[PDB]
Amino acid sequence: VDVTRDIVSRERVWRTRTTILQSTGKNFSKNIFAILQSVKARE
Amino acid sequence: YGILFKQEQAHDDAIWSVAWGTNKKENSETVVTGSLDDLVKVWKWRDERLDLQWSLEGHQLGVVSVDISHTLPIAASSSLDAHIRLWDLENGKQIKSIDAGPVDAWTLAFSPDSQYLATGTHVGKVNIFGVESGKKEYSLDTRGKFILSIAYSPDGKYLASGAIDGIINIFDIATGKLLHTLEGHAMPIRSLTFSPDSQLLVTASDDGYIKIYDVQHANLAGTLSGHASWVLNVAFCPDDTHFVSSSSDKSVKVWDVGTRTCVHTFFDHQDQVWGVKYNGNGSKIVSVGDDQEIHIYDCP
Amino acid sequence: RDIAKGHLKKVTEQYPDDVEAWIELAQILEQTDIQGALSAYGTATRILQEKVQADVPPEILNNVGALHFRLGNLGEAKKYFLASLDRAKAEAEHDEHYYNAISVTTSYNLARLYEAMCEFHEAEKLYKNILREHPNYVDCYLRLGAMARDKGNFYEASDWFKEALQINQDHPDAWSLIGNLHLAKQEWGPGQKKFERILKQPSTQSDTYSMLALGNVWLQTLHQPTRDREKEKRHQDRALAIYKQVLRNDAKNLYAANGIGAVLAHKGYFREARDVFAQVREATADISDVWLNLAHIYVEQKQYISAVQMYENCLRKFYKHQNTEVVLYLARALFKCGKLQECKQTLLKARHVAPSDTVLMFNVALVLQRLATSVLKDEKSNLKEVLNAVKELELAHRYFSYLSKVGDKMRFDLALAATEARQCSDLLSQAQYHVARARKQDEEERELRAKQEQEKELL
Amino acid sequence: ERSGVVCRVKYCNSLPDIPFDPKFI
């Protein structure tokens, strides 16, 4: 109905699900994938 | 409305149960505490100040329940020891140790005439004990999973039981048979209180829901939302006008029976409160917790 | 957005009759620091009063209450929502601006606030007021469901959740919450492939949240005796594949890296685990899981004095006074004195709220056995404590008997209490040996106090 | 003693739920 688009337009979402999982700092995964490959070097 | 007395470091370890005597058998004058430190500290509330009368030991594990007789100046204590020790308070001496062996023991309750001793059991039975005998006279067998909370009707005509997952069982203690098996809760009930007229009944689960049930027709009089944590203990204001709520979040909300309103909240324990009891009229309110510090709340 | 920040602090110090300048200040500040948004709204409340004494439009006041919701200012957040609804009522004729719809979302926020008050009664009231007038809305339809989820799963919780999919099967949040219900039923583990496949339609993909849920339901499969059968090895590598996938699509997810470290720790690389958990540790400490998983490594180096403190640090959340698995994961190789008697006290705390557990009553019997054999063998110890020793081992034998009569165990039968029974019998013999030694030390302390009595008479 | 205390040791992993931040008009 008009109420649905009427509300979901005017509000805002600053807090979702997905960026909870993502960290507020910058933690890249190269270090993570480097040790991922390093344990594979033990394999 | 506030705190009158605060008892700093009243126990070595965390208190689990409280007993404040209501009558004039020198039990309004005293307090009984039950803790993890195996100390049953008899606290003489004399000259409106809290003095240690006795400290009772031998409960080799942490105390799960303490209570004071309505019709007698004696007391009784339980623990995980399954040795329900019976205590004389004028001397601070043990009357007997009721071995509820091997483990099958839980929280206790003085009868309104202080003759029968109800307790919970792992099997779901409710074992009734002779205060004179120390013997399991008969077990109120109502199947379930585990019995957690019980209360006598103070007028001495019913029993209610709170189980490990929200089973409410209504009994006629004159005949010891199950009247109603009420199921308003799903999560564990730790305390339940018959009304002073035994017309109502309070439930304290892990949901913060005080679901108040009628007794005489055994139906829901209303659900009351409480704290954020698990509400643990409850006592009626003995003039049947209020009831107090111990929770798991360092917070004690005080409730009206009718208007379902937090008429007051104390926050004074920095740790999780465990047990509550009023005055003989309900002005003083006693309160324990893991702070090992006992707070006495005047509430006019 | 950065240029927006620059322009906003190009105009904030200025005033070319700034009116909305604080509005579009805070309008980007809601992602950022909330206090900046508060300050912007603060002088924005004022700025609508001097040019003309004009009441603040309720969209502002609702949003500042929304800010205080994530702050500690819950009460005046409630006052903001009340006066917001009043100002929307003061928007008597503004169905162009749709003050009614603004009141709808304001009431949604206020019901969410009543949930923060734990005033679930009034939360129910506001929610059913909105749904009886706008049943097309879903979030109110499921927060009600979430409220009954706090009571339990098979309530109308689960049914509001399913009808939220019935009104909107495209809705990924509710659809995720469907399987979130099924997380309670872990026996519905392998069945969750289907109930987390339904919106693996690629309109919903990519859904990091759901695919991490796949990784999590795939990791709970682990710690089974079938790893040697290559089955949990395949499961470990499959979870690893999920974690590589979420790794490539997001380097900055932290629950992912927790998953990688967990699966490699299950692969026995615990020196290779504290590092990867250290990363998410600086990333955010406020993840309850990583506190546990680090201390598991610590006790794997037997670093108890680094572990149990961080256990009780995990206990510093306002969640549960006796969490069970945390004190389980606490009492693992606890071998020192406080690792024995205060270990017993922790077990008693757990037992107080959990007397149903067979494992816990076994473990108290174990620790009582340990402290009993700590006081009777090279000891030569006090009268009173060895008097308590016989009672406590008697109790331990009562539990040895009691558990052994019970059938169901932790999928490992506890007939191991039988060798504890032969032990406690020979402990009875040892106690009868050493209680005589207790009487000996009593009589010699009597004779030496006689020896001091005579010499003090001499003085 | 002879062996350590028994546990079903698992490196579990929890999930946050949906936040539902109060909305911003």
Query: What one-character-per-residue DSSP string does B118-164 give?
Result: EEE-TTSEEEEEETTT-SEEEEEE--SS-EEEEEE-TTSS-EEEEET
Tell how far CA B29 is from the center of its chain.
Answer: 19
Hey, is A24 helix, strand or coil?
coil
Q: Which of D24, D18, A4 is nearest to C172 (CA)?
A: D18
Kindly report whether the peptide bond that precedes residue C57 is cis, defined as omega within 30 degrees of 0.
no
The four Cα atoms B185, B188, B191, B194 give a dihedral, to 10 degrees, of 30
CB B79 within 8 A of CB B61: yes
Flag if B102 and C120 touch (Cβ within 8 Å). Answer: no
Q: Which of A23, A26, A33 to mutate to test the interface with C (most CBs of C within 10 A)?
A: A23
Euclidean distance between CA atoms B19 and B299, whole angstroms? 18
- The candidate with the shortest Cα–Cα distance to C149, out of C114, C123, C178, is C178
- Please state, as a whole number, how many other Cβ atoms lie within 10 Å of the Cβ of residue C167: 14
Angle subtended at Cα B245 by Cα B242 and Cα B250, rounded to the nearest 5 degrees:
140
How far apart are alpha carbons B93 and C103 in whole angstroms? 66
Q: Decide if C423 contacts C369 (C-beta within 8 A).
A: yes
Contact C315, C350 (CB under 8 A): no
Please name the residue of chain D whose CA is at the shortest distance from the CA of residue A6. Answer: D25
Amino acid identity for residue B76 in this structure: A
3-state secondary structure of C370: helix
CA-closest candidate to residue B9, choices B277, B279, B299, B271: B271
The first and second tokens of residue C102, run together, are 């603004």
CA angle C129, C132, C133 (to 5 degrees): 85
Q: What are phi and psi of B43, to 5 degrees?
A: -105, 100
How many domains does one find in chain B?
A: 1
CB contact under 8 A, C352 and B16: yes
* Subunits in contact with chain D (3 or more CB pairs closer than 8 Å): A, C
> Of C115, C114, C144, whose CA–CA distance to C127 is shortest?
C144
CB of B244 within 8 A of CB of B255?
Answer: yes
Beta carbons of C173 and D14 less than 8 Å apart: no
| Rounded Cα–Cα distance for residues C234 and C227 (Å) | 8
Rounded Cα gap, residues C258 and B179, in angstroms: 52
Q: Which amino acid is at A39?
A: V
Q: Distance (Å, rounded) from C-alpha C111 to C-alpha C131?
A: 12
Residues of C in contact with D13 (CB under 8 A): 215-216, 219, 255, 258-259, 262, 289
The sign of the torsion formed by the CA atoms of C345, C348, C353, C356 equals positive
- B208/C402 touch (CB, cutoff 8 Å), yes or no: no
Say whether the D–B interface has 3 or more Cβ pairs within 8 Å.
no
**Interhelix angle for C139-151 vs C120-133, to 10°?**
150
For residue C5, the cross-strand partners are none
Asked if residues C353 and B107 have their Cβ atoms less than 8 Å apart, the reply is no
Closest partner residue to D22 among C69, C292, C296, by Cβ?
C69
Return the structure tokens found at B21. 């005597």
Which residues make Cβ contacts (< 8 Å) with residue B33, sequence separation at least 6?
B10, B11, B15, B17, B18, B19, B39, B40, B41, B42, B43, B66, B288, B294
CB of C103 closer than 8 Å to CB of C61: no
Q: 3-state class of C276 per DSSP?
A: helix
Q: Which of C74, C114, C117, C118 best tests the B interface by mutation, with the highest count of B CBs <10 A?
A: C118
Does the CB of A41 have a partner CB in chain C at under 8 Å? no
D18/A10 touch (CB, cutoff 8 Å), yes or no: no
Taking an 8 Å cut-off on Cβ atoms, the answer to whether C30 and D24 are in contact is yes
| Cis amide bond preceding C380, omega within 30 | yes
Could you tell me if C377 and C428 are in contact, meaning their C-beta atoms sit under 8 angstroms apart?
Answer: no
Residue B141 Cα, gap to closest chain C Cα (Å): 18
C247 close to A (CB below 8 A): yes
Judged by CB atoms closer than 8 Å, whether chains meet at D25 and A10 is answered as yes
AA identity, residue B273: V
Cα–Cα distance for residue pair C363/C348, rounded to 1 Å: 10
Under DSSP, is residue A22 helix (H, G, I), strand (E, B) or coil?
strand
Q: Helices C120-133 and C99-116, interaxial angle, to 10°?
A: 160
Instruction: State the greatest distance between any 2 C-alpha atoms of chain D, in Å, as a whole number.
Output: 65
Residues 1-25 of D with CB under 8 A from A: 16, 18-19, 21, 23-25
CB contact under 8 A, B226 and C118: yes
For D22, the closest chain A residue by CA position comes to A13
Integer Cα distance of B190 and C352 in angstroms = 11
User: In angstroms, what CA-CA distances link C154 with C138, C146, C160?
Assistant: 19, 12, 11
Task: Enumerate residues 6+ apart whose C-beta is below 8 A from B208.
Answer: B225, B226, B227, B228, B229, B230, B231, B247, C118, C120
Distance separating alpha carbons of residues B288 and B276, to the nearest angstrom: 7
CB contact under 8 A, D11 and C366: no
Residue C98 DSSP label:
T
Residue C360 near residue C350 (C-beta atoms within 8 A): yes
- Within 8 A by CB and 6+ apart from C10, the residues are none
Amino acid at C432: Q
**φ, ψ (nearest 5 deg) of residue B181:** -120, 85
Asked if A27 has any chain C CB less than 8 Å from its own CB, the reply is yes
How far is residue C14 CA from its own chain's centroid?
Answer: 47
Q: List Cβ neighbours of B274 (8 Å cut-off, separation of 6 or more).
A: B14, B15, B16, B17, B18, B232, B233, B246, B288, B289, B290
Q: Residue D14, preceding bond cis, omega within 30 degrees?
A: no
* CB atoms C118 and B164 under 8 Å: no
Residue for token pair 């009431």: C107
- Cα–Cα distance between B277 and B291 in angstroms, integer? 17
What are the angstrom distances between the C-alpha of C340 and each of B295, C313, C371, C379, C387? 32, 20, 7, 17, 18
Q: What counts of helices (H) and strands (E) characterise chain A?
A: 3, 0
Residue with tokens 């060798």: C419
What is the DSSP track for chain B? ---SEEETT-SSS-EEEEEE--STTTTTTEEEEEETTS-EEEEEEETTEEEEEEEE----S-EEEEEE-SSSSEEEEEETT-EEEEEETTTTEEEEEEE--SS----EEE-SSS-EEEEE-TTSEEEEEETTT-SEEEEEE--SS-EEEEEE-TTSS-EEEEETTS-EEEEETTTTEEEEEE---SS---EEEE-TTSSEEEEE-TTSEEEEEESSS--EEEEEE--SS-EEEEEE-TTTSEEEEEESSS-EEEEETTT--EEEEE---SS-EEEEEE-SSSSSEEEEETTS-EEE----
- What angle is formed at CA C70 by the lines to CA C69 and CA C74, rounded to 5 degrees? 35
CA distance D11 to B123: 33
Whether the Cβ atoms of residue C396 and residue C372 lie closer than 8 Å to each other:
yes
C29, C68, C81, C107 from C76: Cα distances, Å = 20, 8, 8, 15
Residue D21: its chain A contacts at CB < 8 A?
A: 13-15
Phi/psi for B252 (5° steps) reads -125, 100
Residues A27, C212: C-beta atoms closer than 8 Å: no
Token pair belonging to C230:
């290559």
Distance between CA C111 and CA C122 in Å, rounded? 7
Q: How far is it, in rounded angstroms, from Cα C315 to Cα C327?
A: 10
* φ, ψ of residue B106 in degrees (nearest 5): -150, -160
User: Is the separation of the CB atoms in C174 and C207 below 8 Å?
Assistant: no
Taking the Cβ of residue A23 and every Cβ of chain C, the question of whether any pair is shorter than 8 Å is answered with yes
Distance of CA B119 to the CA centre of its chain: 12
Q: Residue B118: give the domain boundaries.
A: 1-300
Q: Answer for the pair C352, C322: CB distance below 8 angstroms, yes or no.
A: yes
**Tokens in use for C365?**
């019997």
In angstroms, the CA B92 to CA B42 distance is 8
Among left, alpha and beta (phi > 0; psi -120 to 50; other), residue B198 is left
Taking the CA of residue C63 and the nearest CA in chain D, the distance in Å comes to 5
Is C214 within 8 Å of chain A by CB?
no
Q: Do A21 and C212 touch (CB under 8 A)?
A: yes
- Measured CA to CA in angstroms, residue A41 lies from A34, A37, C111, C271, C343 at distances of 10, 6, 55, 15, 41
CA B246/CA B193 separation, integer angstroms: 13
CA–CA gap between residue B185 and residue C151 (Å, rounded): 8
The total of other beta-carbon atoms located within 10 Å of residue C361's CB is: 23
Q: Strands B30-35 and B40-46, how do they pair?
A: antiparallel
Query: Are residues B108 and B117 in contact, defined by beta-carbon separation less than 8 angstroms?
Result: yes
Both tokens of B142, joined, read 């109502």
Handedness of CA C437, C438, C440, C444 (dihedral sign): positive
The tokens describing D19, both together, are: 């936040």
**Amino acid (one-letter) located at C385:** E
CA–CA gap between residue C28 and residue C37 (Å, rounded): 8
Closest residue by Cα to residue C155 from C146, C167, C165: C146
**Among the partner residues C30, C137, C208, nearest to A14 by beta-carbon distance:** C30
How far apart (Å, rounded) are the C-alpha atoms in residues C95 and C31?
A: 29
What is the C-alpha to C-alpha distance for residues C113 and C106, in angstroms, rounded to an integer?
A: 10
Write down how long chain D is.
Answer: 25
Do D13 and C258 count as a contact with CB atoms less than 8 A apart?
Answer: yes
Q: At what angle do helices C358-373 and C417-458 cross, to 10 degrees?
A: 40
Q: Taking CB atoms and an 8 Å limit, are A21 and C255 in contact across chains?
A: yes
Residue C132 to residue A5: CA distance in whole angstroms:
18
Rounded to the nearest angstrom, the minimum Cα separation between A40 and chain C is 11
Q: How far apart are CA C310 and CA C317, in angstroms?
A: 12
Please tell me whether residue C22 adopts helix, strand or coil conformation: helix
Q: Do chains C and A touch (3 or more CB pairs under 8 A)?
A: yes
Residues of C in contact with A38 (CB under 8 A): 272
Instruction: Give the whole-angstrom CA distance, residue C401 versus residue B220.
Output: 43
Partner residue opposite A20 with nearest CB, options D19, D23, D24? D19
In this structure, what token pair is assigned to residue C167?
């009104």
Q: Which residues on B lie below 8 Å from C349 (Cβ)?
A: 14, 36
Using beta carbons and an 8 Å cutoff, which residues of D are at the interface with C? 1, 4-15, 17-18, 20-25
Q: Which two tokens stand for residue C457?
A: 């008479």
* Beta-carbon count within 10 A of C318 CB: 11
Assess contact for D12 and C219: CB atoms under 8 A: yes
- CA distances (Å), origin B91, targets B95, C283, C374: 10, 61, 36
How many residue contacts between B and C have a Cβ separation below 8 Å? 66
From CA C418, how far away is CA D12, in angstroms rounded?
33
Nearest to C352 among B64, B225, B226 (CB): B64
* Matching residue, tokens 């105009």: C11
d(CA C113, CA C211): 31
Nearest CB to D24: which of A12, A16, A17? A12
Test B102 with C398 for CB contact under 8 angstroms: yes
Interface test with D, best of C81, C223, C274 (most D CBs within 10 A): C223
| Chain D residue whose CA is closest to C224 | D8
Closest-CA residue to B224 (of C353, C120, C24): C120
- CB neighbour burial string for C248-286, b if at least 16 within 10 angstroms, e if fewer: eebbbbbbbbbbbbbbbbbbeebebbbebbebbbebeee
